[PDB]
Design a binder for this molecule. Structure first.
Ligand SMILES: Nc1ncnc2c1ncn2[C@@H]1O[C@H](COP(=O)(O)OP(=O)(O)OC[C@H]2O[C@H](O)[C@H](O)[C@@H]2O)[C@@H](O)[C@H]1O
Ligand SMILES: NC(=O)c1cccc(N)c1
Ligand SMILES: [Cl-]
Ligand SMILES: [Zn+2]
Length: 282
C-alpha cells in the first residue's frame, strides 16, 4: 500500500503529426467495419478531459506523488461529465459496433453515461456502487460510496436482507471480481478487434486482456498519448487525444455522439439500433 509497484510513470507523450493521425483513424474505421466482435478496453486517460487526473500521465496521481506533488481534480466524481469518448462508446454499443466494454476505471462515468451494465466489466470496481455481502445485490448510488478497500459503508441491504453493504473499490491486495473478469476474459478471447483507449496496460490481468484478442488472428489497436506495456503487440498505435480520435472515428462511421441527459443507469443492452451501410473496403 506504501510499497506497492506502481509501474512506469510520467513517460513522454507522443503526438502523431496530423497527416499520420487522420490516416491512422481511417485505418481504425476500416478495422471496426471488418470486425464481427469489437471489445474496447478503457483506463483513466479517457476521463482526463472531464477533470479527472490519470495515474501515470505527466500530472497523474502516481507521477505527482513520485515528484512530491498532488494530482489536481477540476471536478468532483459526482460533478464529472462523461466525455465525447464515453458518449462515443454508448452509441457504438447502441448500433451493434461494440460487443463488450472492459474498464479499469472506478470513476463511475461508464455507468452514468447510460452504457449497459451487462456489456460492462468494471475490473477495479466503481466509486458509486455498493454490494451486499449476504446476497451480492449491487446498488448504483448518486453519490460516491465513502469507503475504498471492500469495507462496510454503514448502509444495509433492502432486498424485500438487512445484509452489510460494502464498497466495490479493490485495494492493492484484492483479486478482481470473478464475474467481471470471466466476462472480460471471454469477451477479449472471442473478439476479432480489441481497441485500448487511454490505458498504459501495466496492471495484470486488465492490461493483458487485450493481448488475448491476438490469439487466433485478432487485431489490437492501442490509443494512448504515452507508450504502453504491449505497444509491440499492436497492429495500430494512435498517439493523440482519445476525444479527437473517437470524434473523427464516429464521423467516418457516420455516427453522431449522443447527448448526455445527466446521470442514468441502464442494466441491459437493447437490440442494436439502425446504422449506416458499410463501405466497400478492398
Ligand atoms: N486524453 C487522452 N487521450 C489519450 N491518451 C490519454 C489521454 N489522457 C491520458 N492518456 C493516457 O492514458 C494513460 C492512462 O494510463 P494510467 O495512468 O496508467 O491509467 P490506467 O487506467 O492504465 O491504470 C491502471 C490502474 O492503475 C491504477 O493503480 C488503478 O488501479 C488503475 O485502474 C496514460 O498512458 C496517458 O498517456
Ligand atoms: N478515472 C478514474 O477511474 C480515477 C479514479 C480515481 C483517481 C483517478 N486519478 C482516476
Ligand atoms: Cl483504495
Ligand atoms: Zn442483500
Amino acid at each position: 500500500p506504501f510499497t506497492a509497484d506502481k509501474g512506469k510513470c510520467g513517460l513522454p507523450e507522443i503526438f502523431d503529426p496530423p497527416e499520420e493521425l487522420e490516416r491512422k483513424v481511417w485505418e481504425l474505421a476500416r478495422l471496426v467495419w471488418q470486425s464481427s466482435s469489437v471489445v474496447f478496453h478503457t483506463g483513466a486517460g479517457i476521463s482526463t478531459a472531464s477533470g479527472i487526473p490519470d495515474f501515470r500521465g505527466p500530472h497523474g496521481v502516481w507521477t505527482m506523488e513520485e515528484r512530491g506533488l498532488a494530482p489536481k481534480f477540476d471536478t468532483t466524481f459526482e460533478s464529472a461529465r462523461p466525455t465525447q469518448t464515453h458518449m462515443a462508446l454508448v452509441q457504438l454499443e447502441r448500433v451493434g459496433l461494440l460487443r463488450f466494454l472492459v474498464s479499469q476505471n472506478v470513476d463511475g462515468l461508464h455507468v452514468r453515461s447510460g452504457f449497459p451494465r451487462d456489456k460492462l466489466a468494471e475490473l477495479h470496481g466503481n466509486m458509486f456502487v455498493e454490494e451486499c455481502a449476504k446476497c451480492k445485490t449491487q446498488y448504483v448510488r448518486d453519490t460516491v460510496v465513502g469507503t475504498m478497500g471492500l469495507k462496510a459503508t454503514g448502509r444495509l441491504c433492502t432486498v424485500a436482507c438487512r445484509g452489510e453493504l460494502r464498497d466495490t473499490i479493490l485495494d492493492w491486495e484484492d483479486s478482481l471480481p470473478d464475474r467481471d473478469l470471466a466476462l472480460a476474459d471471454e469477451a477479449s478471447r472471442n473478439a476479432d478487434l480489441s481497441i485500448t483507449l487511454g490505458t498504459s496496460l501495466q496492471i495484470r490481468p486488465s492490461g493483458n486482456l487485450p493481448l488475448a484478442t491476438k490469439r487466433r488472428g485478432g487485431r489490437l489497436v492501442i490509443v494512448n498519448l504515452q507508450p504502453t506495456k504491449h505497444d509491440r503487440h499492436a497492429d495500430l498505435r494512435i498517439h493523440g487525444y482519445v476525444d479527437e480520435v473517437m470524434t473523427r472515428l464516429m464521423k467516418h462511421l457516420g455516427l453522431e455522439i449522443p447527448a448526455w441527459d445527466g446521470p442514468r443507469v441502464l442494466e441491459r443492452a437493447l437490440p442494436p439500433l439502425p446504422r449506416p451501410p458499410t463501405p466497400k473496403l478492398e
